[PDB]
Design a protein that fits this description.
- Its cofactor is Fe cation.
- One of its GO terms (cellular component) is cytoplasm.
- The chain is of the alpha+beta class.
- It has five domains: 143 residues, Lipoxygenase-1, CATH 2.60.60.20; 100 residues, Lipoxygenase-1, Domain 2 (Lipoxygenase-1, domain 2), CATH 4.10.375.10; 89 residues, Lipoxygenase-1, domain 3; 134 residues, Nuclear Transport Factor 2, Chain: A; 347 residues, Lipoxygenase-1, Domain 5 (Lipoxygenase-1, domain 5, Up-down Bundle), CATH 1.20.245.10.
- Helices cover 36% and strands 13% of the residues.
- The chain contains 25 helices and 22 strands.
- Helix 2 packs parallel to helix 12, helix 10 crosses helix 14 and helix 16 runs antiparallel to helix 19.
- 48% of the residues are buried.
- The structure holds fe (ii) ion.
- The site of fe (ii) ion has 7 residues, from helix 10 and helix 19.
Length: 818
């Protein structure tokens, strides 16, 4: 007769306005069809009343009673239509129907019916490959997909749920100034790039190839995550930083209310001790904003205090040590660039006709390898390098033509000591050299030194290295390889895999907040004259450098074992648990990452078989095949030709692709992301820019190295004002929202009705817990101290799976969520 159902929803900001004829639902049959084969639809059914029974009821949520006339002729409900007749939208959580129970997991904004082209349809929590879809739901499944894809035209609106691709043509602002014009990134051979979410705002007036600015950069609506607590809206903080807080900081400098430069290292440490005094109206501009009220401690009047960075919590001075400089290449913010070095001297692939002779000036006899010969070091696999020579060299001339930017293309040679720690043994600071250079600056090699001006020169050499490293980290390791590389897979998934699809359910938790942060990023973070361009060395060249890097991006080399082998920091070895032997045995990121990688592998390998018995079952999944084809040929379309893309005709291939996508989105992004403020919150430890080359022996600047080495250093790195802005942004990006969903968690316990999938998932969480105890034990092992803690005494907890809220230096979210 009647089916008792409970609707749980969330009003935008009494429940009684929801009763009456405000909201109707219509059940759809999974089993009885009409003469066109489509599931039969019941009658419009309105909310009956507010349920106060249910005690399991989350915050902001409210439950409503409802009764469906559902009869013999109608069969089993497999979906439902919902119409919202109210003017304001509400967030639908779920429908439960009792009698056994049917569960519908919705988690979607429902706008006023008149705004929707066709009626919002939701499905029950059963999982089906396309060939298993009940026949009465087949056309409903596929029409919902066509609806999500749209038609590639039109300006997207807030309530749209249309997923499509476009190039990075929305970063420049040529209508405001030709100086803010930028190259379109994506869709050419000069500038290949991942695609991003189409917004459709239309061309600028001055350039038909650049998209006009907008106050809100659209994402499909359910990608724009709300938060119950405003403190958790960390992604919007990036937008307030650009629009409100940065200008407020600038004004204090424009009005000469604070010294323009740091004059000593204590001036930097003061930021997290007594604070910085700023004008009352600057404070009062910043202080009441959500996020920025959590970012800084304040007296409400003139003081802002930054949190004390982890890297200085035990020793203020230990970042200066050569031990920590090298340790952070294997356990720092950017732990995935170091390579094995198997010949000496190191070589370049770059054209000597353009840049001059590219031969290394580092001589073997000059290096202290703890009594080893070069041949012994090379052969024992104890020689490594941090090589930014070929990466940076093509951009040095252009960067150094900028006002107040000067860099080298750096190389660092490291030696793996018998005690298992790395030490740095030389830094080569390279400059391009063509006839008809106006500059007389030359390349040079700097070797470690603990006293005198040679010590300062060596500290300045590490700084140039770390400028290189930070730019690479922020633009490549971080932006390109996580945020940018993942968005095409997000878009493809929603375009081609139905919410009913097992691989949809598998992957989509690993996309939470990714489109949203990326869009806010295109607007405020990587835009023309945005945060990154105004805080980091390459200025207007930054994002385009990441395009140049993308030329060499290989999907299958994002797999952790493949990465470690390609970089020469491990070798394949089947006698081992993970199939590889580390050449740096206490390499924290890699050792811990392999543990996470294996756990994700086991989980995918257990999930996939539940839905695909054989390789044929993969080949014949038409959604799956359309998904992958588009993700490659459209989403990463500039690399579509490349031979290394898995073909996706086998269970092996499906598992491989899912495993890698999940790896990028969770542990890789975590390992590169949540260290930014812990390590970089001391600007001297992770400088973002350099402003001068090394001084000539005859000059006042050289005498400053002798007489005031802290000032020389500070004059060389990021200025005070850009430091304040970059500290503020990395502080945001290193903070876990209280409402994050971590690896081994899902936002709903009823995401599927398949108990087998649910039990596999619980084993995965149990393993991650198991892994966490093991990493604790590694951090507590006194013989691992040198690489896992260092002289900074900072336990490597970046790949601990779990965390509480905040700036914690641990915790692996499911997704790229900040
Ligand atoms: Fe991030």
């Amino acid at each position: 007769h009647k089916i008792k159902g409970t609707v749980v929803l969330m009003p935008k900001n009494n429940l009684n306005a929801f009763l009456g004829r405000s909201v109707s639902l219509q059940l759809i049959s999974a089993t009885k069809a009409d003469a066109h084969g489509k599931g039969k639809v019941g009658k419009d059914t309105f909310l009956e009343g507010i349920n106060t029974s249910l005690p399991t009821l989350g915050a902001g949520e409210s439950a409503f009673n409802i009764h469906f006339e559902w009869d013999g002729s109608m069969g089993i409900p497999g979906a439902f239509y919902i119409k919202n007749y109210m003017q304001v939208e509400f967030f639908l959580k779920s429908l439960t129907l009792e009698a056994g129970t049917i569960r519908f997991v919705c988690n979607s904004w429902v706008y006023n019916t008149k705004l929707y082209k066709s009626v919002r349809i939701f499905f029950a929590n059963h999982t089906y490959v396309p060939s298993e879809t009940p026949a009465p739901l087949v056309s409903y499944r596929e029409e919902e997909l066509k609806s999500l894809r749209g038609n590639g035209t039109g300006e997207r609106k807030e309530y749209d749920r249309i997923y499509d691709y476009d190039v990075y043509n929305d970063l420049g602002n040529p209508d405001k100034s030709e100086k803010l014009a930028r190259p379109v990134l994506g869709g050419s051979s000069t500038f290949p790039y991942p695609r991003r979410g189409r917004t459709g705002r239309g061309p600028t007036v001055t350039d038909p190839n650049t998209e006009k600015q907008g106050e809100v950069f659209y994402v499909p609506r359910d990608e724009n995550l709300g938060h119950l607590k405003s403190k958790d809206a960390l992604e919007i903080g990036t937008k307030s930083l650009s629009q409100i807080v940065q200008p407020a900081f600038e004004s204090a400098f424009d009005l000469k209310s604070t010294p323009i430069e740091f004059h000593s290292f204590q001036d930097v440490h003061d930021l997290y001790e007594g604070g910085i005094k700023l004008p009352r109206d600057v404070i009062s501009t910043i202080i009441p904003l959500p996020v920025i009220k959590e970012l800084y401690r304040t007296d409400g009047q003139h003081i802002l205090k930054f949190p004390q960075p982890h890297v200085v919590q035990v020793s203020q001075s230990a970042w200066m040590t050569d031990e920590e400089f090298a340790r952070e290449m294997i356990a720092g913010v950017n732990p995935c660039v170091i390579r094995g070095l198997e010949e000496f001297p190191p070589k370049s692939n770059l054209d000597p006709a353009i840049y001059g002779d590219q031969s290394s000036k580092i001589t073997a006899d000059s290096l202290d390898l703890d009594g080893y010969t070069m041949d012994e070091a090379l052969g024992s696999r104890r020689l490594f390098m941090l090589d930014y020579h070929d990466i940076f060299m093509p951009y040095v001339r252009q960067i150094n033509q900028l006002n107040s930017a000067k860099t080298y293309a750096t190389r660092t040679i490291l030696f793996l000591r018998e005690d298992g720690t790395l030490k740095p043994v030389a830094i080569e600071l390279s400059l391009p050299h063509s006839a008809g250079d106006l500059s007389a600056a030359v390349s040079q090699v700097v070797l470690p030194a603990k006293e005198g001006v040679e010590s300062t020169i060596w500290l300045l050499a590490k700084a140039y290295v770390i400028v290189n490293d930070s730019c690479y980290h922020q633009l490549m390791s971080h932006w390109l390889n996580t945020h940018a590389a993942m968005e095409p897979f997000v878009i493809a998934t929603h375009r081609h895999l139905s919410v009913l699809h097992p691989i949809y359910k598998l992957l989509t938790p690993h996309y939470r907040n990714n489109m949203n942060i990326n869009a806010l990023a295109r607007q405020s973070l990587i835009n023309a004259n945005g945060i990154i361009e105004t805080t980091f060395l390459p200025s207007k060249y930054s994002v385009e450098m990441s395009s140049a890097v993308y030329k060499n991006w290989v999907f299958t080399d994002q797999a952790l074992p493949a990465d470690l082998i390609k970089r020469g920091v491990a070798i394949k070895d089947p006698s081992t648990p993970h199939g590889v032997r580390l050449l740096i045995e206490d390499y924290p990121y890699a050792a811990d990452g392999l543990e996470i990688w294996a756990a994700i592998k086991t989980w995918v390998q257990e999930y996939v078989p539940l839905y695909y018995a054989r390789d044929d079952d993969v080949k014949n999944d038409s959604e799956l095949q359309h998904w992958w084809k588009e993700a490659v040929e459209k989403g990463h379309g500039d690399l579509k030709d490349k031979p290394w893309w898995p073909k996706l005709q086998t269970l092996e291939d499906l598992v491989e692709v899912c495993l890698i996508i999940i790896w990028i989105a969770s542990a890789l992004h975590a390992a590169v992301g949540f260290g930014q403020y812990p390590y970089g919150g001391l600007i001297m430890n992770r400088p973002t820019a350099s402003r001068r080359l090394l001084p000539e022996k005859g000059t006042p600047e050289y005498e400053e190295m002798i007489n005031n080495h802290e000032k020389a250093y500070l004059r060389t790195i990021t200025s005070k004002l850009p430091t304040l802005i970059s500290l503020s942004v990395i502080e945001i990006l290193s903070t876990h929202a209280s409402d994050e969903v971590y690896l081994g968690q899902r936002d709903n316990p009823h995401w599927t009705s398949d108990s087998k999938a649910l039990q596999a998932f619980q084993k995965f969480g149990n393993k991650l817990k198991e892994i966490e105890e093991k990493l604790v034990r590694r951090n507590n092992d006194p013989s691992l101290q040198g690489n896992r803690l260092g002289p900074v005494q900072l336990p490597y907890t970046l790949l601990y799976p779990s965390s509480e809220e905040g700036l914690t230096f641990r915790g692996i979210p499911n997704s790229i969520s900040i």
